[PDB]
Amino acid sequence: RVFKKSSPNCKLTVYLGKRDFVDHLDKVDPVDGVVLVDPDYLKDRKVFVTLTCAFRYGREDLDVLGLSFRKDLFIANYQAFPPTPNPPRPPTRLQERLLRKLGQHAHPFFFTIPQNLPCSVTLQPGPEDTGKACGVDFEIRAFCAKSLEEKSHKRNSVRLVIRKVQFAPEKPGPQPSAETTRHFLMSDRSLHLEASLDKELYYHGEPLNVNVHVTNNSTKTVKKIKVSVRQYADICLFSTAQYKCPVAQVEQDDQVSPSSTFCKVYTITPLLSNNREKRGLALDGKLKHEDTNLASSTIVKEVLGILVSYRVKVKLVVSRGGDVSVELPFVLMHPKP
Amino acid sequence: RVFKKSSPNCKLTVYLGKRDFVDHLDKVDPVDGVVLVDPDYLKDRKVFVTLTCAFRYGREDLDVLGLSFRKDLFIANYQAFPPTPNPPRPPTRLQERLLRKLGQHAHPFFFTIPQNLPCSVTLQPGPEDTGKACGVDFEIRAFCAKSLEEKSHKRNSVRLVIRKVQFAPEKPGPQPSAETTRHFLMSDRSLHLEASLDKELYYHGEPLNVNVHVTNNSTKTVKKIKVSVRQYADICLFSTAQYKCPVAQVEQDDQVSPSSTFCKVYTITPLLSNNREKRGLALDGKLKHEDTNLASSTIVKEVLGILVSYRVKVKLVVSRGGDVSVELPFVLMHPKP
Amino acid sequence: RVFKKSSPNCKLTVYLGKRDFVDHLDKVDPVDGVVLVDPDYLKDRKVFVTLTCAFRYGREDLDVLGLSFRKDLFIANYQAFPPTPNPPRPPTRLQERLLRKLGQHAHPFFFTIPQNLPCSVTLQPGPEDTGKACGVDFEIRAFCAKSLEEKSHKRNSVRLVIRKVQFAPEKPGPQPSAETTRHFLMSDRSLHLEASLDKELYYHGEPLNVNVHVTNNSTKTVKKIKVSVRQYADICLFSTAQYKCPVAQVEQDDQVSPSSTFCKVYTITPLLSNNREKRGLALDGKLKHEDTNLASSTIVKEVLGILVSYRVKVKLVVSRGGDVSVELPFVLMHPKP
Ligand SMILES: O=P(O)(O)O[C@H]1[C@H](OP(=O)(O)O)[C@@H](OP(=O)(O)O)[C@H](OP(=O)(O)O)[C@@H](OP(=O)(O)O)[C@H]1OP(=O)(O)O
Ligand SMILES: O=P(O)(O)O[C@H]1[C@H](OP(=O)(O)O)[C@@H](OP(=O)(O)O)[C@H](OP(=O)(O)O)[C@@H](OP(=O)(O)O)[C@H]1OP(=O)(O)O
Ligand SMILES: O=P(O)(O)O[C@H]1[C@H](OP(=O)(O)O)[C@@H](OP(=O)(O)O)[C@H](OP(=O)(O)O)[C@@H](OP(=O)(O)O)[C@H]1OP(=O)(O)O
Ligand SMILES: O=P(O)(O)O[C@H]1[C@H](OP(=O)(O)O)[C@@H](OP(=O)(O)O)[C@H](OP(=O)(O)O)[C@@H](OP(=O)(O)O)[C@H]1OP(=O)(O)O
Ligand SMILES: O=P(O)(O)O[C@H]1[C@H](OP(=O)(O)O)[C@@H](OP(=O)(O)O)[C@H](OP(=O)(O)O)[C@@H](OP(=O)(O)O)[C@H]1OP(=O)(O)O
Ligand SMILES: O=P(O)(O)O[C@H]1[C@H](OP(=O)(O)O)[C@@H](OP(=O)(O)O)[C@H](OP(=O)(O)O)[C@@H](OP(=O)(O)O)[C@H]1OP(=O)(O)O
């Protein structure tokens, strides 16, 4: 339908046409909206609308102490009333539709979301956390004041969360494929591991099929085989820290004897619902009263923000040392609607 | 009876007449006590008594790193032995009673608690926290040394926690009453919410009766009604952060159809016992092996400290947008004994 | 057997003769090992081996913000290939054994662990923590690069955790024995507590026998008796903080009437398995996929590090005030193999 929220006193309502604004890499969907204000209520006050992209990292108690990392990556402030020159660019048919039903006390606003900006990512809070979640969020905020500097008023202000999202590219990428050979010393023996995925791109909730082939031309015994999907979150503040969290694991007592080959497909699905306990897991941005998913793969630089990526790991568990592994990068994304 | 505690080696005991010292706004009950020392034990050492009002904010691991906020808001140091001039002001009948039963090795001490000081508030720790709790505490400390600068000794020192408390004013304040009207666009329609409490002041454990009246002269349908009590903790460090935590909620699928009125009382009771899981909730100061309650409303400025306050929220849940709300400030306090 | 681990790509393996290196107080077992490299893989790159003793304190989110305390207490960097002069000192019979089976692409390395260094201690993480644990750890790291400054590569590098450990001295120390007398005012009454352990040194998992004797020549009634073992962790960063955590408790409603004596042995055993919930408890260093124990007593200065020590507390619970206590230091250590 149309998305709208009011101030607590109801003197102020913001309408938007949607909450998700798609990053097309060359450009982003612009935010076209309308603020409706009560006339006699603001009086000499002005109506401002603000678009903020904010990046916060740190627990709630670090907020009070001024220790958490809080940076606005993007701020645009718009004086919507008293009305201003019309560009940019026209009014969209949604604004026109809304300015008619609401009348002269409705006022359009327009923002472009800069492309060089992270997408909406929520870092999953633990059950104890009570503040707002760490990550990158976007917020449309409308309020009434004499000037931008005047402090905030809760009763007058509407805060509205929106999201910058990306969708799977249309061009299929190259097939993920990796291999690792453990050579053994003087003898010509070796323990060979090959693995691959059918494709580079998977959709949330779609099972990955991991092709595993083991050539054990050695005297060691593979005693377990472990297949996992790991999330990689690059947190870029002053220094970029990379956090890894497994989000799916199949572990079987499959054995590969000496002088033997082994070939199987392992099917595995990364789901947020098996990971609601992992603090700090990257989630696609938290919306109102909706459910989210594991954060989509970022389509790219180490500017401030959060970059998310995924890999399959296949590990051959050998006794003592001797373990063998490959990793398979893939992409995890929603399909374009 | 009389409150007393000894050092671990028992060479030193502090007696006080009570643990709660009442803030009367114009003044505070003074701390009149006695320290009993073993004569031959201190020898050339002096006996000091200290009254400290301390304000700490931050988890335990931040202590070690020097990151937590720790400020003594008030320190008074008293050399009780070798004895000193008698004022102020006399000895109280409690000190006289105690100096008789204990004799020449008992020594009085006297402190005034400055009024411009927060009251005792404990921030509720999570099950994981193991240090002392954040908040504002008062401590009488007695110990033996050559001078005040000499470092602390656990075996010699007695630490005794006391509380600065407030009680409900005698004059009833004005009846809490609020209203919010959602006007609808061009049509003369409206969705009106009125609410009130019988009184401004409630006692811990006393039920609040929330009078709710809804006039739905609109086409929208109230589908749920939500009544809650929220604690508001103003944490004033360098910047004042306000934390909110609900501590009671009634949520019913009560509906208010278009062109209809609705009138009901909702009864709701904020109890700590339904909130033992909420980390950082403001509690009246933690005493020894006793149970506490939700922190009392502060009777007032943004000096360093913790200010606590309470509100009822009444929310009419309407589909899509359209929600309507009022808030009702009230005071929550113990009655004066 | 022999301990070995490879890089993820298997081009690089580090062998060591053991993982625990014993601090003999006058000196430490040296780390004698071998790195095996694939010849054509490194090409123009060099092989380095690093011995690092690291000290980290702080939760995971403080890492990203640069707030945690991270200090390398000791770093030694060794260019093992292209080979270098032979001392020190010879090659051990383990290196010789290994250089034969592996051949010319195996290269010895040798490190002395400085004595003035803490032992391996892990601070017990909570279930929520996901990073590496706080405490003091030692790590052998081998990798391929042109120079030491070149950044790290995960596929090339092997990381291997080792431990600096201590064992119980051979000379028995003096018997722990303490006493505390509560004298009562004017009357010649008194409440006397004596306690002792059979010995100063106990082994992990060995029960302590606490000899308790109470002479109640007073009018007060001991109503409970509490015996506990407490861990004391001195965390020495910029300022040394001492953290205490009980790790065993016997609490009985044993009573000692006025004009009565009382004599009993209380047996108590500190076990990690009854304390897996205590965040920050000092543990002997966490090895790979093994189980650990409560940290051993440190055999000593307040340099940077973690010092661990233990005491029995015996407390006589008297009504109102009047409690009486002693503490008994003891040592808790593994026997030398
Ligand atoms: O606006 P936020 O700071 O995100 O806080 C909101 C807000 O609480 P306030 O009344 O303090 O503004 C909601 O109220 P509305 O503005 O929506 O009326 C409230 O109520 P709802 O549940 O009805 O949305 C909701 O509380 P809850 O925890 O029950 O969701 C709560 O959310 P947070 O405090 O959790 O952000
Ligand atoms: O212990 P593992 O890692 O499984 O490997 C060992 C190792 O052989 P590698 O050189 O391949 O590690 C032993 O070699 P030594 O160091 O003992 O010389 C060898 O002993 P032999 O050389 O006498 O064969 C032993 O065999 P085992 O432990 O069964 O006696 C063999 O394990 P596998 O030969 O079973 O692989
Ligand atoms: O004095 P605090 O620093 O607040 O610590 C006390 C104190 O422990 P110490 O023995 O280290 O001083 C109590 O001992 P007393 O001074 O009262 O003899 C002890 O024992 P009680 O339980 O008998 O009071 C209690 O331990 P517990 O955790 O069992 O209450 C503990 O409290 P905290 O360490 O939790 O503050
Ligand atoms: O979707 P809601 O927020 O419940 O309100 C809508 C909205 O009316 P408002 O202007 O009061 O929001 C629609 O207006 P349009 O934007 O679609 O013009 C209206 O449609 P009509 O104008 O055709 O009546 C629709 O009615 P419905 O969704 O039942 O077709 C009506 O809901 P109510 O009229 O039931 O309040
Ligand atoms: O090397 P670390 O940084 O300590 O991390 C390791 C490592 O994960 P990577 O694949 O990211 O290096 C292990 O892999 P190997 O180097 O041993 O192949 C992995 O797998 P294992 O379980 O097979 O040891 C293990 O994951 P797990 O959590 O399952 O132990 C994990 O440990 P941490 O991330 O917990 O340190
Ligand atoms: O309350 P407790 O700490 O158990 O000790 C009290 C206290 O005696 P102490 O001086 O030893 O503390 C009372 O002394 P007063 O301050 O009341 O003078 C005394 O009262 P009497 O002096 O009248 O004996 C009272 O006795 P009770 O409370 O049973 O009347 C006695 O407790 P015990 O005498 O039982 O130890």
Chains interfacing with C (3 or more CB pairs < 8 Å):
A, B
Q: How far is B64 from chain A (nearest CA, A)?
A: 15
List helix spans (H) across chain B: 39-42, 60-65, 93-102
Angstrom CA distances, B217 to A37, B73, B188, B261, C22, stand at: 21, 55, 9, 8, 83
**CA dist., res. A185 & res. A295, Å (int):** 43
Report how far apart the first and last C-alpha atoms of chain A are (Å, whole number): 16
Residue contact A10–B62, C-beta within 8 A: no
Phi–psi pair at C168, nearest 5 degrees = -60, 130
| Contact (Cβ atoms closer than 8 angstroms) between residue C124 and residue C132 | no
Say whether residue B263 is in contact with chain A using an 8 A CB cutoff. no
**Which pair of structure tokens corresponds to residue C192?**
């006397």
**CA dist., res. B250 & res. B252, Å (int):** 7
User: What residues in C contact A237, CB-CB < 8 Å?
Assistant: 64-65
Angstrom CA distances, C197 to B171, C177, C178, C314, C329, stand at: 63, 7, 10, 11, 9
Chains interfacing with A (3 or more CB pairs < 8 Å):
B, C
- Beta-carbon contacts of C171 under 8 Å, excluding residues fewer than 6 positions away, are none
Domain boundaries defined on chain B: 1-170, 174-337
Helix, strand, coil shares of chain A, percent, nearest 5, are 5, 50, 45
**Which pair of structure tokens corresponds to residue C294?**
């409560």
Nearest CA to ligand 4 atom 10: A101
Of B227, B228, B244, B318, the residue with max ligand 1 atoms within 8 A of its CB, to mutate for a pocket test, comes to B244
**CA dist., res. C176 & res. C326, Å (int):** 11
Alpha-carbon dihedral C49, C54, C58, C64, rounded to 10 degrees: -30
**For residue A212, which of A188, A235, A230, A228 has the smallest C-alpha distance?**
A228
Cα C244 to averaged position of ligand 3 atoms, centre (Å): 10
ω before B88 within 30° of 0 (cis)?
A: yes
What is the DSSP track for B44-66?
T-EEEEEEEEEEEES-HHHHHHT
**For residue B158, which of B280, B6, B320, B39 has the smallest C-alpha distance?**
B6
Chain A residue with Cα closest to C67: A67
Angstrom CA distances, B167 to B300, B310, C140, stand at: 12, 16, 63
**Beta-bridge partner residues of A228:** A249, A313
**For residue C314, which of C232, C244, C243, C246 has the smallest C-alpha distance?**
C246
**CA dist., res. B316 & res. A162, Å (int):** 24
DSSP C115: S
Q: Kindly provide the residue ranges of all beta strands, DSSP E only, lying in A282-321, ordered along the sequence.
A: 282-284, 305-318
Q: How far is C289 from chain A (nearest CA, A)?
A: 12
| Contact (Cβ atoms closer than 8 angstroms) between residue C312 and residue C227 | yes
| Contact (Cβ atoms closer than 8 angstroms) between residue A259 and residue A216 | yes
Query: Interior CA angle at C8 toward C5 and C13, to 5°?
Result: 35
**Beta-bridge partner residues of A13:** A6, A36
Residue contact A238–C66, C-beta within 8 A: yes
**For residue C196, which of C270, C294, C266 has the smallest C-alpha distance?**
C266
**Beta-bridge partner residues of C310:** C231, C330
Q: Residues of A20-52 as b/e, b for ≥16 C-beta within 10 angstroms?
A: bbbbeeeebbebbbbbbbbeeebeebbbbbbbb
ω before B258 within 30° of 0 (cis)?
A: no
Q: How many CB atoms lie within 10 A of CB C181?
A: 15
DSSP B320: S
**CA dist., res. A325 & res. A313, Å (int):** 7
Sheet holding A240-252: strands in order across? Answer: A201-203, A324-333, A305-318, A222-236, A240-252
Q: Give the number of C-alpha atoms closer than 13 A to the C-alpha of residue A95, restricted to the C-beta side.
A: 19
CA C163 to chain centre: 9
Phi–psi pair at C96, nearest 5 degrees = -60, -50
Q: 3-state class of A225 per DSSP?
A: strand
Say whether residue A321 is in contact with chain C using an 8 A CB cutoff. yes
**For residue A43, which of A132, A148, A156, A152 has the smallest C-alpha distance?**
A156
**Strands A324-333 and A201-203, sheet pairing:** parallel
| Contact (Cβ atoms closer than 8 angstroms) between residue C308 and residue C292 | no
Ligand 3 atom with least separation from CA of C313: 10
Which experimental approach was used here? Answer: X-ray
Mutate to test the interface with C, among B61, B67, B105, B160 (most CBs of C within 10 A): B61
CA B113 to chain centre: 16
| Contact (Cβ atoms closer than 8 angstroms) between residue A322 and residue C3 | no
- Beta-carbon contacts of A19 under 8 Å, excluding residues fewer than 6 positions away, are A3, A161, A162, A163, A287
Q: How far is B287 from chain A (nearest CA, A)?
A: 24
What is the DSSP track for A240-277?
EEEEEEEEEEEEE---B-TTEEEEEEEEE---GGG-TT
**Which pair of structure tokens corresponds to residue B82?**
């070798």
Torsion sign across C-alpha atoms C246, C248, C251, C254: negative
**CA dist., res. A13 & res. B221, Å (int):** 19
- What is the H or E stretch that residue C97 is in? helix C93-102
Chain A residue with Cα closest to B279: A128
**Which pair of structure tokens corresponds to residue B221?**
């349908």
Chain C residue with Cα closest to A62: C62
Long-range contacts of residues B247-251, Cβ cutoff 8 Å, at least 24 apart: B247/B271, B247/B272, B247/B274, B247/B275, B247/B278, B247/B281, B247/B294, B248/B274, B250/B226, B251/B224, B251/B225, B251/B226, B251/B227
**CA dist., res. B38 & res. C253, Å (int):** 31
- Beta-carbon contacts of A248 under 8 Å, excluding residues fewer than 6 positions away, are A228, A229, A268, A269, A270, A271, A274
Nearest CA to ligand 5 atom 11: A244
Ligand 5 atom with least separation from CA of C159: 1
- Beta-carbon contacts of A163 under 8 Å, excluding residues fewer than 6 positions away, are A19, A20, A21, A119, A120, A138, A284, A285, A287
User: What residues in A contact B68, CB-CB < 8 Å?
Assistant: 65
**CA dist., res. A44 & res. B108, Å (int):** 64
Sheet holding A177-183: strands in order across? Answer: A177-183, A190-197, A208-217, A260-268
Residue contact B185–A102, C-beta within 8 A: yes
User: What residues in B contact C237, CB-CB < 8 Å?
Assistant: 64-65
User: What residues in A contact C6, CB-CB < 8 Å?
Assistant: 182, 321-323
Q: 3-state class of C198 per DSSP?
A: coil
| Contact (Cβ atoms closer than 8 angstroms) between residue C284 and residue C293 | yes
Residue contact B58–A66, C-beta within 8 A: no
Phi–psi pair at A272, nearest 5 degrees = -55, -35
Of C185, C216, C219, the residue with max ligand 6 atoms within 8 A of its CB, to mutate for a pocket test, comes to C219
Cα B1 to averaged position of ligand 6 atoms, centre (Å): 10
User: What residues in B contact A4, CB-CB < 8 Å?
Assistant: 320-321
**CA dist., res. C148 & res. C157, Å (int):** 13
User: What residues in A contact C4, CB-CB < 8 Å?
Assistant: 320-321
Nearest CA to ligand 1 atom 23: B315
Residue contact A130–B237, C-beta within 8 A: no
Q: Residues of A91-102 as b/e, b for ≥16 C-beta within 10 angstroms?
A: ebebbeebbeeb
| Contact (Cβ atoms closer than 8 angstroms) between residue A202 and residue A175 | no
Radius of gyration over every alpha carbon of chain B, rounded to an integer in angstroms:
26
Of B10, B38, B65, the CB nearest to C69: B65
Ligand 5 atom with least separation from CA of C154: 12
User: What residues in B contact A103, CB-CB < 8 Å?
Assistant: 185-186
Cβ neighbourhood burial of C227 (10 Å; 0-12, 13-18, 19+): buried
Angstrom CA distances, B210 to B173, B176, B331, C314, stand at: 17, 10, 14, 54
| Contact (Cβ atoms closer than 8 angstroms) between residue B30 and residue B115 | no
Angstrom CA distances, A289 to A161, A280, A286, B298, B316, stand at: 12, 20, 8, 34, 17
Residue ranges lining ligand 3, Cβ < 6 Å: B 8; C 244, 313, 315, 323, 325
Helix, strand, coil shares of chain B, percent, nearest 5, are 5, 50, 45
Q: Residues of C293-320 as b/e, b for ≥16 C-beta within 10 angstroms?
A: ebbbbbeeeeebbbbbbbbbbbbbbbee
Ligand 6 atom with least separation from CA of C184: 11
Q: Is B249 in the pocket of ligand 1 (CB under 6 A)?
A: no
**For residue B168, which of B3, B2, B4, B330 has the smallest C-alpha distance?**
B330
**CA dist., res. B61 & res. C61, Å (int):** 12
Q: Is C219 in the pocket of ligand 6 (CB under 6 A)?
A: yes
**CA dist., res. A229 & res. A312, Å (int):** 4
Residue contact C13–A321, C-beta within 8 A: yes
**CA dist., res. A158 & res. A142, Å (int):** 5
**Which ligand is located closest to the Cα atom of residue B187?**
4
**CA dist., res. B201 & res. B174, Å (int):** 9
| Contact (Cβ atoms closer than 8 angstroms) between residue A108 and residue A97 | no
Chain B residue with Cα closest to A15: B321
Residue type, B221: T
Residue contact B185–A61, C-beta within 8 A: no
**CA dist., res. B229 & res. B314, Å (int):** 9
**For residue C59, which of C118, C126, C119, C137 has the smallest C-alpha distance?**
C126
Residue type, B311: R
**CA dist., res. A283 & res. A233, Å (int):** 10
Residue contact B128–C245, C-beta within 8 A: no
**CA dist., res. C115 & res. A133, Å (int):** 45
**CA dist., res. A187 & res. B322, Å (int):** 77
- What is the H or E stretch that residue A100 is in? helix A93-102
**CA dist., res. C39 & res. C42, Å (int):** 6
Q: How many CB atoms lie within 10 A of CB A287?
A: 15
**CA dist., res. C284 & res. C297, Å (int):** 10
Phi–psi pair at B239, nearest 5 degrees = -115, 145
**CA dist., res. A330 & res. A312, Å (int):** 8
Residue type, C118: P
- What is the H or E stretch that residue B20 is in? strand B20-22
Cα B131 to averaged position of ligand 1 atoms, centre (Å): 31
**CA dist., res. C165 & res. C28, Å (int):** 9
CA A138 to chain centre: 12
**For residue C162, which of C56, C31, C281 has the smallest C-alpha distance?**
C31
Mutate to test the interface with B, among C56, C65, C69 (most CBs of B within 10 A): C69
Residue contact A64–B235, C-beta within 8 A: yes
**CA dist., res. C118 & res. C46, Å (int):** 31
**Domain C174-337 is of which CATH architecture?**
Sandwich (2.60)
- Beta-carbon contacts of A250 under 8 Å, excluding residues fewer than 6 positions away, are A226, A227, A228, A266, A268
**For residue C284, which of C249, C332, C226 has the smallest C-alpha distance?**
C332
Q: 3-state class of B317 per DSSP?
A: strand
**CA dist., res. B16 & res. C83, Å (int):** 76
| Contact (Cβ atoms closer than 8 angstroms) between residue A126 and residue C128 | yes
| Contact (Cβ atoms closer than 8 angstroms) between residue C225 and residue C327 | no
